[PDB]
A paper describes a structure:
Six amino acid residues (Arg89, Arg135, Asp309, Ser311, Arg312, and Asp318) positioned at the cleft and the acetyl-CoA binding site were mutated and recombinant proteins were prepared to investigate their contributions to catalytic activity. The polypeptide region in which Asp309, Ser311, and Arg312 are located forms part of the side of the cleft on the domain I side, with Ser311 and Arg312 positioned at the edge of the cleft, and Asp309 located near the bottom of the cleft. Mutation of these residues resulted in the complete loss of enzyme activity. Finally, Asp318 is located at the edge of the cleft on the opposite side from the observed acetyl-CoA binding site.
[name], a black-pigmented Gram-negative rod-type bacterium, is a keystone pathogen linked to the onset and progression of periodontitis.
Residue numbers in the entry:
A (entry chain B): -3 to 336
B (entry chain A): -3 to 335
């Protein structure tokens, strides 16, 4: 929306105006059910819960939730599309090797079923990870839904709502990769830059100005590490000639006009960056957390980028609000994909 | 700024209570002379200025400074210890290929002379860089003064005065290495941890809780990069078994008790960190700058650590206050080096 600080409210509203179907494989997980209850009450999405119908209904009753009577519940052991989904899974895993017998096992795994629902067009997005490892969430996602065209990996971005309104869009920047890839290749780093810029435009209403960060600015501190960022910058520009991407540059050159004017003259990014691309996961994971904690920024994420259809992974330590927000964001990813 | 001011007053007081000799090789640089004037008025340190005596006196008179009459001024071209210092430089560097001829050239260089004064024990520390490159300041420092016992490398730390008083010491943490080493070895990273902990005690009166940072916490995300931090943690503990150092851990595990309880139970650091050790310069240089800019934190530094006697390097764009502060910090480092 017009102010970057109001983005979460805008995300919720956008979801409400165009209701999407979101699958929650963790249909008995309490925080997930609490979130689903509020989401359904607020008309944000149409919820699909995975689990034994009697078990799920009993859990809803046990937690005292009142807004989930009209939620779709699908039992992985018994539902109308079970054989169809089994055959689809076999088709996908035919070359790598999957027998009918163990396809029949896997289709009853809620995480696999969830991905097959989305892949089949019977839902618009999936969220899990409140009671599953990231690895266990991502494995069926990458096996069944897969990465989007051109993308060889997925990455995680955060909305960083900072108290420095003079930077980004009223203090908001997107930053990546903060979750997935330990040490991106130049090619992987270029993918991250393009994906994060696309996410920024599509979901956050930001006109991207993408800074490829380094301890060097435009050859000030040459090093093999610096070379990787330089190459990633060139590769990202080739991938997406429409985007404003520049690098390599230090964090102060990215944000501060005075510094940019000296260290990166004429740059279309330096001094007004609103998307920060970190060279490694050590940088990404440490830096966003320190900006959050030491800077009192609000960090919303991780938002997964590069999947062929919207899949997000929650922290196992997530709050109910975290789930509510990430479901709304998942819906916005789906809406964006449909409008483009 | 307001965030830094109380600790900085403590640094100044500690300097005043145990006066050290600080060499200023840039004895004609105006900001340096303004700083030296206030430092001498406040009895923070004993200043040694390097330059032609008549040139320095003329400059002081031109600027109208009134507190520098008793400052020691040493002319590199003409002073009674010139031969002694030349021979010391040769003793240190002759095996590295320094000739007597070239030693006699270098002793006339104020940065080399300054380092030779310190190395001789005729001063306690040195600051420069208002009108010299970092490279030119550090070269004689590393050649002549060299690294402290157990250190074979130096690093740059910042006092990061954050607006999050619930973390570190009323919002203050020391963070390193933010300046020097692109990709520390496990050994170099261990040295950073120990050096930064010692700097934290010496300068900030902090009881160190040192977090060796990673994208992993205690084996949550195993990787070659994670392995390096794990090894650095073990090596740091071996170097200084007295210090409270733990890792590998994520930044949230370092700072947040609730997260520490889940991800690093029983840690002697997690949830209480006041010193953050970054695994690479990409991490260090990006992270402190983003906390400064996006977080409105005040970053005082870089402070160079690991030297046998303190040498610090100012920005060429530094303020008078920057110089005053860094001299006081250098003095506190000198006090620590003498213990």
């Amino acid at each position: 929306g017009p102010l970057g600080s109001d983005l979460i409210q805008d995300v919720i509203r956008r979801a409400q105006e165009n209701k999407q179907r979101i699958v929650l494989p963790e249909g008995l997980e309490p925080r997930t059910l609490e979130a689903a209850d509020r989401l359904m009450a607020d008309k944000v999405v149409n919820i699909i819960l995975i689990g034994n119908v009697d078990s799920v209904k009993a859990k809803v009753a046990e937690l005292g939730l009142k807004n989930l009577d009209e939620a779709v519940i699908i039992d992985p052991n018994n539902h109308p599309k079970k054989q169809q989904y089994t055959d689809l899974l076999l088709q996908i895993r035919q070359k790598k090797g999957l027998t009918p017998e163990k396809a029949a096992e896997l289709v009853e795994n809620p995480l696999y079923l969830g991905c097959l629902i989305v892949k089949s067009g019977d839902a618009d997005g999936l969220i899990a990870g409140a009671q599953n490892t990231t690895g266990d969430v991502l494995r069926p996602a990458l096996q069944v839904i897969k990465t989007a065209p051109g993308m060889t990996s997925v990455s995680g971005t955060f909305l960083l709502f900072t108290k420095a309104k003079e930077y980004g869009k009223d203090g908001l920047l997107l930053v990546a990769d903060c979750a997935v890839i330990p040490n991106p290749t130049a090619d992987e780093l270029a993918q991250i830059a393009v994906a994060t810029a696309r996410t920024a435009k599509a979901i956050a209403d930001i006109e991207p100005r993408v800074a490829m960060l380094s301890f060097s600015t435009k050859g000030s501190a040459k090093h093999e590490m610096t070379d990787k960022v330089v190459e990633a910058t060139r590769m990202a520009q080739e991938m997406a000639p429409d985007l404003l991407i520049d690098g390599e540059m230090q964090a102060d050159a990215a944000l501060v006009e005075r510094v940019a004017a000296l260290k990166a003259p004429g740059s279309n990014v330096a001094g007004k960056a609103n998307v920060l691309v970190f060279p490694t996961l050590e940088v990404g994971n440490i830096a966003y957390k320190l900006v959050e904690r030491l800077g009192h920024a609000e960090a919303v994420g991780p938002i997964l980028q590069g999947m062929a259809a919207p899949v997000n992974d929650l922290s196992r330590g997530c709050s109910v609000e975290d789930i509510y927000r990430m479901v709304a964001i998942t819906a916005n990813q789906a809406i964006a994909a449909k409008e483009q």
